Amino acid sequence: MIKVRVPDFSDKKFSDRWRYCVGTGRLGLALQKEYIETLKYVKENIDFKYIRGHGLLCDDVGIYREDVVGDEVKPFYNFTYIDRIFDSFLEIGIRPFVEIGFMPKKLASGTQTVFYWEGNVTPPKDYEKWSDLVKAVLHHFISRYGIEEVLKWPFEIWNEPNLKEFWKDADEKEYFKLYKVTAKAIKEVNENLKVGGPAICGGADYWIEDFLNFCYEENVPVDFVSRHAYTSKQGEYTPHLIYQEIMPSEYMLNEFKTVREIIKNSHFPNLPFHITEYNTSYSPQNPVHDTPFNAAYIARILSEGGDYVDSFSYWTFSDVFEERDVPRSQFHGGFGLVALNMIPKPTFYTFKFFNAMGEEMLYRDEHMLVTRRDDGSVALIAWNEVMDKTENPDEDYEVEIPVRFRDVFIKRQLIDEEHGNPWGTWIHMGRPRYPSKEQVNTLREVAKPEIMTSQPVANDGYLNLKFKLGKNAVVLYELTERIDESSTYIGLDDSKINGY
Amino acid sequence: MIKVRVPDFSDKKFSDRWRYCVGTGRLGLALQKEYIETLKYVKENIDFKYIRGHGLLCDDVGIYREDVVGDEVKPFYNFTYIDRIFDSFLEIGIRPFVEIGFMPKKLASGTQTVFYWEGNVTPPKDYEKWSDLVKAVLHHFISRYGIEEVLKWPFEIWNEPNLKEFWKDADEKEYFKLYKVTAKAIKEVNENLKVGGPAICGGADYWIEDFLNFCYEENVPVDFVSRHAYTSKQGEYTPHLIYQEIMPSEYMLNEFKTVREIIKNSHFPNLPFHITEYNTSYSPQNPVHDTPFNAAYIARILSEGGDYVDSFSYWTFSDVFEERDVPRSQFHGGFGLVALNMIPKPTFYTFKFFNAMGEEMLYRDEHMLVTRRDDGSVALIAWNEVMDKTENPDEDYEVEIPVRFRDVFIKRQLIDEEHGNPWGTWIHMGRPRYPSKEQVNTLREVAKPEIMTSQPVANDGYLNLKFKLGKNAVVLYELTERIDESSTYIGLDDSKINGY
Amino acid sequence: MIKVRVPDFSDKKFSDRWRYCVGTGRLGLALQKEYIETLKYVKENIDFKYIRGHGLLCDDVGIYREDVVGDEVKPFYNFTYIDRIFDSFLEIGIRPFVEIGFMPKKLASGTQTVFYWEGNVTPPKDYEKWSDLVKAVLHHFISRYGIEEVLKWPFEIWNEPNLKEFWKDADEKEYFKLYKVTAKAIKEVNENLKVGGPAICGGADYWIEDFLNFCYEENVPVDFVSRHAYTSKQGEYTPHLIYQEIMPSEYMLNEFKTVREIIKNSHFPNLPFHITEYNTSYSPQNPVHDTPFNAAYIARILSEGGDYVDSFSYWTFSDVFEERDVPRSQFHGGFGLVALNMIPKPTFYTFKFFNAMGEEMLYRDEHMLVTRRDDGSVALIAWNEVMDKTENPDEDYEVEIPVRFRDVFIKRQLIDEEHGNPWGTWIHMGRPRYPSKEQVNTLREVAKPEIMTSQPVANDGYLNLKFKLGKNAVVLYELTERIDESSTYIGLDDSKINGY
Amino acid sequence: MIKVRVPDFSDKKFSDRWRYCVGTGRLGLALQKEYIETLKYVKENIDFKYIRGHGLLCDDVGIYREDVVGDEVKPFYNFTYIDRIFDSFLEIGIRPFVEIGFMPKKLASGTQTVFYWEGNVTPPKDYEKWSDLVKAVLHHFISRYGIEEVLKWPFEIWNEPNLKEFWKDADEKEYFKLYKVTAKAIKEVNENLKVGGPAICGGADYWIEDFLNFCYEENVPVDFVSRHAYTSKQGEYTPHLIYQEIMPSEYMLNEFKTVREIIKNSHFPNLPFHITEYNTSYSPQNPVHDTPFNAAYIARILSEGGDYVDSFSYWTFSDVFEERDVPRSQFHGGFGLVALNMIPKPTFYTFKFFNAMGEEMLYRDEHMLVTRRDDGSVALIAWNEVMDKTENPDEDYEVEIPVRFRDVFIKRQLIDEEHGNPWGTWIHMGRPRYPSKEQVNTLREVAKPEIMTSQPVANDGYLNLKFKLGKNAVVLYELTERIDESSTYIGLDDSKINGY
Ligand SMILES: O[C@@H]1[C@@H](O)[C@H](O)OC[C@H]1O
Ligand SMILES: O[C@@H]1[C@@H](O)[C@H](O)OC[C@H]1O
Ligand SMILES: O[C@@H]1[C@@H](O)[C@H](O)OC[C@H]1O
Ligand SMILES: O[C@@H]1[C@@H](O)[C@H](O)OC[C@H]1O
């Protein structure tokens, strides 16, 4: 097995940076009833601070318009939708991690678009008009939400401009020009608004180096660096899905650690660092996302990720997504922590379990995290992902947890391939594309972790836990102080009940 | 083990008489927020048609009042509370199985009361005034709810008048006088209103014989017979609780069968028969009610009870009860199917599981019920209660269920001492009398049955199920037709996912 | 003034055909949270049976797709969205008055589109593929909702094919070919499904004549005729709005009466007739829709319209609309009975008031409707729209209403330019485009009719009502029987209260 | 008329002391669904900080019990109900202004009770047992709610001990003994808990003098003085109601000012002062409470009361009351700001209107209050109660309000005998005792103030308001800055709409 003796003293500290932000589909989809039910649902379980998605400036949200009064062409800024959208984000208690872009149609210089919803990926045919666009939006936000509020929303400029698909010809030099005009426009409204970039994705860190040199040398303000991180190798698309190999979690944590260095060695060594987007597969159609595997895999990233970054946003919170057309089945490898019909995927409970963690970090290794809360209670999260096809995935443990109590109440929650695996049951049902109300209900019933309570006594100050982790399992133990009130029940004796 | 080959043809039929009615605490408690949340909660899971409780005429509901205008003493009927009460019963979609009584204070002839809330158990000092009371209430009901509605509410006269505690000196002859004056008063308002009695409890069936002879001979209208049934022997009260031996279920079913005969041999052989109240222990403080045992025990009664009676009301739906003062702990042996804070006891899921049963009864024995629904799907409920203290409570099964399909989707739900046993966890926690919000949450999380899906194939038209029932376990299997859509997912291959 | 003596006897009868159906924006918008809140809101006030809108087959709903597996091109029908959409329609208790169309992109033969959302207006490049599309959808509906349900949904083929904008070159002969292939496809699935057309709009009734001759002669099944009706003359668009003259209501009622004749003189004289769309202005940007005028104007149509048609659907129930891009202000002349943020426009209360009408029609003239309910109570609705710019819009009345009671309780609700005129207040506020939460609240507070109760006595069986209707006012009077219980309050005397 | 020129500069300041606390029926009634719906309803409109009521220790809540184990008699403290009660108070966001008392049955020394619910009004037969009772409760509160929370709850000892009905023989010397034992018991648990008294009612201030001398001389801790205030003269009870003359508001404000002096001249000159209970009539059956008069009368007290006291609690928030048996009609002169079925009485809107007031008090006289909010907007509340039976109750005004804007948006809300007078309509209906669902709905529809918006321009910095106050009327004007956006609507011209 694997024996461990969790030390009674706290050296390091565990932060809630893992729940600072979550990813989402384009802001236009936030108008959907399904979207908001899920957001509320998710917020009642995980207290994410911000939400990050594309499309703020796309035409479905329809902010940028133009009116013709003869020969005169004046721009018109329509806020009917982002108002409703941002109003609903705040109502639920979540701030927007604004991402400026993409390029509105009546402002584009080219015709290249991206995704099924076709967002324009070309630069403005007139940066002057673009600058006024940006300023008109911020002023409006300030106008409706107050400067104190807006001041808390960071502004990421564009998305993966290092890719030909998101930025015309990956024109690095043009991006920096976009960054400057926008960073300037924003700071014009209020010098305190947070702005950053480059929003690139793994495999072009030189972009961040140039991005930071560019700002220093051209005197462009930067408030934070932005980047994405995934671990899926190349795969070939089916007209339905893609399967990819997932590199171990270690390689993502290195990318975090790496880009951290590039920042501390730049002219802005103290800039905050935000992984504005992460997950295993970078495709909205890879079933890895629906598997109990994805949950055990991410478990580690939530465990260590916060040591190197200021925040890392899981892409995404819901399957309400359209980049590759409308989903075509209950389960389809969508990014979301929650599937359609608010059916929590196992990855959802990994996040849920981390709500149990406390400030004091007592122990931690590649597959386990043990912390202590304010009240003195302890919580442990172990996870056993199976990266390969082993015959014996199992893993036994025997952890000695220190406890300031003698009588310990134990609450155990388990998530593996047999528990909290709606995807597995979906298969049992025959992979229905459009399940019926009852199939959906059965799924919802299955989509809950297994809970086991118990009650042991800690001797010599330590409680010894023994347990086995099945394939891709993830377990959480919360050990609190048990204060028995049994002696208060005059005549209490369960043995006086038939069979007990 | 125990092998069974469920026949493919249906002889007998299974009815929903088991869910016709449920018991409740005095109607005054229906004013409590806690009460109504629980009623709604329960109705969303079990479609009970009627609700039966005492106190309609007690003073907390305050219908009967008297005003003094000098020497003149006129009665005043206050409907502020039963209006709200009955309005809320209908809003939720449940009809009242009205029980006239007890005796209001300003109408009583004695001072003897019953229960902690002290309901007057003496006859009216003036049956004339009582008759006008009854008529004024019915007219009001008719007035607010319409005659079509009221016409559906049966009226039970008094409660266990065979006991000295509920009726002064158990005056049988006086009861019949009460019955007549009331039965007459009611029929005066509308000859179609349903009325019956004697509402006695086990061990005095001669009361029903005399009750029926009395009506025939004195020409008093009867529309239904009423009686209670329990199976707890004598026990000694603690200032906190009582423990009692529970006689096997067979003896309750005999009482049903028995009183059935007494009716078919009377002058009114076709009168409907209502067990307006039943359960294992007749005390609101016997922990048997909170145990997974009670659930497995009642399972049988829900299985056969309907063969002999028109309805049998489980006493009660909630622990919102006060007969023996306010409860003093999360679990205290209350009658309710649901404990305070809407925590379902295991007995609750027995009822829940029976919602799965269909009209066609294929097989049935002392511990198992197997039926078929309209769609052709099959549902099975097995139960293994442990009446004694055996070392090997287990019981294996191997049932051959006939199926009109070849591909079968299976949904299994299990309730035993390890699953859906909040009471057990309550013990783990140290029997807290006033649990904290989180203890209550853990309980709610534990208070759900275990669900397992799977997917086998039926060969030769039969699917073979093998399974073990632990101590006091109760399981439900729903076998529906599995229509696989997997071939629609181009390139679908789970083996292309890390570890699968 | 205007004196009237409502006769005590009922000749004609008033039907609820006015609430059979309502219009809506494209079905895709039904995915919006805003949309559904409003639908629920509206359904709680007006019991519309069906809802009619375009876009069932447009690409945002995304039903029609195509997968490429080499050289093989197989079609794929995605039901993820209409399932959610139709599921939510039924959840709220409203049936879809299905309108097949428009033309999906991967099936179109041309490139001509209509509206801001660009629905393809060209015929299929292969009617064979189109026929399979239609059949696949109906089978799916049957599959999820059951044949008994679907059988209640009528199917209208296309929209205004008489206009070059909705049908390529208004090819009448091509439309009939579309109608036939579709009507055949539908009837193939189930011979009982209701289907009809031509869905034309005023000024081309010859289309209905040819449509009916075409079906008779070519043996194409028809189950109902479909047409639209508006009364707005030509107007010139602004890049923001359009103003149009509204012809009196008489001309719309004639169009109803007219097309009725064309049907009774055809080969199908008994076919039902549905005005699947109506209102004053046919533009989603004419402020007439937001004015208390529109409410008084439609009042008449709800009064007489049902005499000539089987149903007439008000276009539309909500301002959640996108035909002319996203709205750009709280009030913008949208079709909806309800403005964004669920602010009821005055037209909404006209419909609300008609919920008061009963079966027995006692009196009716060009500006007043008087009916009697089952209980014998009477309800009156008078309205005074101002079509021109008069100096004295007022109108006095003096109606003698017959009453089976002597003591009458009166409930009066008034809607005019001073009451229930959110639009007016919006102006007061300075026409904010994006009102704040409180501005929206004030509007919601203003957006309610004025209510006045009173209590007179009917002498000689008649109650005399005297009242004045302001500009565009609309009033409703409900006279019920007052049963005074005052004598039950011993010592009741309001004059014993300071000042009374 | 009455001309006034509100000064542009702020001398005095207006506080929210008027909304610090509200009265309630005994805590046991807080278990009622009706009670809590109303509390929530009320809290969504008025942000009361605390809630004060009797019965914490009465037997329906059932805290104090005793178990017999032979000859041994140990006390048992049951917290099942106050837990639910206080839990629900905090859930809604309202703190309890705890009032210790009355005397539990198994602790009483006499048999004298008070009210329909019979609370024991005799002292403990053993102060030792009583002291342990108090301490056990506080420890439990601390235990479940945390010391930081409980520390915010003030503790008032007993109720009107100056009356023979609430304290045996009004034994002043015994009360002080009660006060000491309790004040000591409390301070034992935590020296910081707030405690005070004497809770007397008008006409015995010498009690407060002795109470303060008693504490100083006997060294008993005091943290606040407590007293009640009413203005209803003697009246004679009917078996249904009582009518009383209401002395002008001036006399209540004097009582406030008076008792203030008695405190500043005592040995504890800085003790806070709480009018833990006030209203016009001190009877739960005087229709004055339901009249628009009561609303205009209290308007003044909310205006000036805060100048002399730390808080004054309106008795009560709801008609959910039982002191004089269960109410017997929709309107019955109950204390509540809200009648049963959540129908706001006019007094409710007086409180609602004061939510509009700001910190800066610009002007104030016996019938008007004018303030300015942070944003610079102004709000005015005028009221015209009719104390006598005048032929001309009317009162004209002409106020000059200073405004930092030129374009002013006006929102006017009016409450008088014709608007927001459910009681009046109730009369119209014939004073139904048990209204039907629709009668209740009409009432709810009538029970709203009249709102009128408008839009004028302020010249020379002042806006001139002219208006008439009807009988017992109460009006609120909120003048905010109007920022017109009309010029943004290209082609906007309402005159192009039929009739405009
Ligand atoms: O939009 C997402 C993009 O930002 C990321 O880089 O790759 C995955 C996509 O879903
Ligand atoms: O009130 C119930 C009574 O009717 C029954 O007979 O015994 C149990 C009690 O709870
Ligand atoms: O879509 C609608 C169309 O059907 C009708 O004919 O004209 C008005 C439009 O909004
Ligand atoms: O209980 C209240 C009492 O405290 C007060 O003094 O008089 C009115 C009563 O309702």
Instruction: For chain C, give percent helix, strand, coil, nearest 5.
Output: 35, 25, 40
User: Of the bound ligands, which one is closest to the alpha carbon of residue C115?
Assistant: 3
Mark which residues 386-405 of C lie under 8 Å from D by CB: 386-390, 393
Q: Does C79 touch chain A (CB under 8 A)?
A: yes
Phi/psi at B319 (5° precision): -85, 0
Catalytic choice (B99, B156, B160, B360): B160
Angle between helical axes of B346-353 and B33-45 (0-180°, round to 10): 40
CA angle A444, A447, A450 (to 5 degrees): 130
List the residue whose alpha carbon is closest to atom 2 of ligand 3. Answer: C282
If you count them, how many residues does chain B have? 500
d(CA B166, CA B115): 9
Superfamily of domain D1-14+359-500: Glycosyl hydrolase domain; family 39 (2.60.40.1500)
Cβ atoms of B193 and B157 within 8 Å: the answer is no
d(CA D317, CA D35): 10
User: Of the bound ligands, which one is closest to the alpha carbon of residue D166?
Assistant: 4
d(CA C361, CA C481): 19
Q: Which atom of ligand 4 is nearest to the CA of D284?
A: 10
CB of A160 sitting under 6 A from ligand 1: yes
Residue D353: exposed, middle, or buried by beta-carbon count in 10 A (0-12, 13-18, 19+)? buried
Strand pairing of A195-201 and A224-229? parallel
Q: Report which residue type is found at B158.
A: W
Cβ atoms of A277 and A315 within 8 Å: the answer is yes
Mark which residues 466-485 of B lie under 8 Å from A by CB: 471-472, 482-485
Give me ligand 2 centre to Cα B298, in Å: 18
Phi/psi at A491 (5° precision): 80, 5
d(CA D168, CA C42): 60
Residue ranges of the domains in chain C? Answer: 1-14+359-500, 15-358
Contact list in C for residue A31 (CB cut-off 8 A) is: 31-34
C242 SS3 class: coil
Phi/psi at A18 (5° precision): -65, -20
Resolution to 1 decimal place, in Å:
2.4
**Per-residue three-class SS string for B333-353:** CCCCCEECCCEECHHHHHHHH
Q: Which atom of ligand 1 is nearest to the CA of A201?
A: 6
**Per-residue three-class SS string for C391-426:** CCCCEEEEEEEECCCCEEEEEEEEECCCCCCHHHHH
Burial C368-397 (b: 16+ CB within 10 A, else e): bbbbbeeeebbbbbbbbbbbeeeeebebeb
For A112, the token pair is 């290249």
Residue D455: exposed, middle, or buried by beta-carbon count in 10 A (0-12, 13-18, 19+)? middle
Distance of CA D488 to the CA centre of its chain: 47
Q: Which secondary structure element, helix H or strand E, spans residue B246, and what is its range?
A: none
d(CA C479, CA C404): 11
A290/chain B closest Cα distance in angstroms: 11
Q: What is the CATH number of domain D15-358?
A: 3.20.20.80
C-alpha dihedral, A325 to A331 to A336 to A337, nearest 10°: 170
Cα-trace Rg, chain D: 25
Q: Could you confirm whether B118 is annotated as catalytic?
A: no
CA neighbor of B63 nearest in space, from B121, B1, B138: B138
Q: Could you give the residue numbers annotated as active site of D?
A: 160, 277
The structure's method of determination equals X-ray
The contacts of residue B209 (CB under 8 Å, 6+ apart) are B262, B266
D385 SS3 class: coil
Distance of CA D248 to the CA centre of its chain: 18
B182/chain A closest Cα distance in angstroms: 42
Phi-psi bin for B347: left (phi > 0), alpha (psi -120 to 50), beta?
Answer: alpha
Cβ atoms of B44 and D292 within 8 Å: the answer is no
d(CA B178, CA B185): 10
d(CA D229, CA D275): 7
Cα-trace Rg, chain C: 25
Phi/psi at B196 (5° precision): -165, -175
For D332, the token pair is 């019955």
Q: Please report the number of interchain residue pairs, chain A to chain D, with beta-carbon separation below 8 angstroms.
A: 4
Measured between CB atoms, which of C33, C325, C436 is closest to A65?
A: C325
* End-to-end Cα spacing for chain A: 35
Cβ atoms of B72 and B136 within 8 Å: the answer is no
Burial A97-126 (b: 16+ CB within 10 A, else e): bbbbbbbbeebbeeebbbbebebbbbbbee
Q: Report which residue type is found at C154.
A: P
Cβ atoms of D78 and D60 within 8 Å: the answer is no
Q: Which atom of ligand 1 is nearest to the CA of A283?
A: 8
Residue of B nearest to C68 (CA): B490
DSSP 8-class letter at A123: P
Cα→Cα distances A388→A245, A248, A384, B495, B497, Å: 10, 10, 12, 11, 9
Q: Does D70 touch chain C (CB under 8 A)?
A: no
d(CA C349, CA C474): 9
Pocket test for ligand 1, best of A277, A281, A288, A332 (most atoms within 8 A of CB): A277
Cβ atoms of C481 and C377 within 8 Å: the answer is yes
Q: Could you confirm whether A160 is annotated as catalytic?
A: yes
Subunits next to A (3 or more Cβ pairs <8 Å) are B, C, D
d(CA C44, CA C49): 12
CA neighbor of C328 nearest in space, from A79, A132, D485, A56: A79
The contacts of residue A250 (CB under 8 Å, 6+ apart) are none
Measured between CB atoms, which of A33, A326, A329 is closest to C33?
A: A33
D260 SS3 class: helix
